[PDB]
Design a protein around this nucleic acid. Structure first.
Length: 160
RNA sequence: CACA
């Protein structure tokens, strides 16, 4: 499931209490403890919708000890293969236009809308190959359209 | 992005 979070760009004295207070103030419940390492941490949310809420609310936006936090789906290294999630999609972007961007980097095996509270849309995309998804991640992340900047990240590819 |  996609309820696991990676928390990146942490300060050298950020501790579980700091992170606990960040997630409390944004009213994100968590299902377990914060595991804080050197410069990064992990936490579980109760389900997928809360995890996405935390990403959309905190990642690139919340500053802790004067550093912007990265909050992203935790993805094991070896499971960064065909699958990506695209965030910050313009609310009225026709799917055909989105598709015309995706296919510039490979064959789309599936593109699923992820229902969300935000104004912006979210899709999960499976390319046919690791190389295609890498290219799409590199070229779509940061792309500006209709006054929004796409955010693209890996999600676990557990079957490739 | 976790591994003595």
């Amino acid at each position: 499931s996609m309820n696991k979070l990676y928390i990146g760009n942490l300060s050298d004295h950020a501790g579980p209490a700091d992170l606990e207070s960040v997630f409390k103030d944004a009213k994100i419940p968590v299902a377990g403890p914060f595991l804080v390492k050197t410069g990064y941490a992990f936490v579980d949310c109760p389900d997928e919708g809360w995890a996405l809420k935390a990403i959309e609310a905190l990642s690139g936006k919340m500053e802790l000890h004067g550093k912007p936090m990265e909050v992203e789906h935790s993805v094991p290294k070896r499971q960064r293969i065909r699958k990506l999630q695209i965030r910050n999609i313009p609310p009225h972007l026709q799917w055909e236009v989105l598709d015309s961007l995706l296919v510039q980097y490979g064959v789309v095996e599936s593109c699923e809308q992820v229902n969300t509270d935000s104004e912006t849309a979210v899709v999960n995309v499976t390319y046919s190959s690791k190389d295609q998804a890498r290219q799409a991640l590199d070229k779509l992340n940061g792309f500006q359209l209709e006054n929004f900047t796409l955010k693209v990240a890996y999600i676990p590819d557990e079957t490739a």
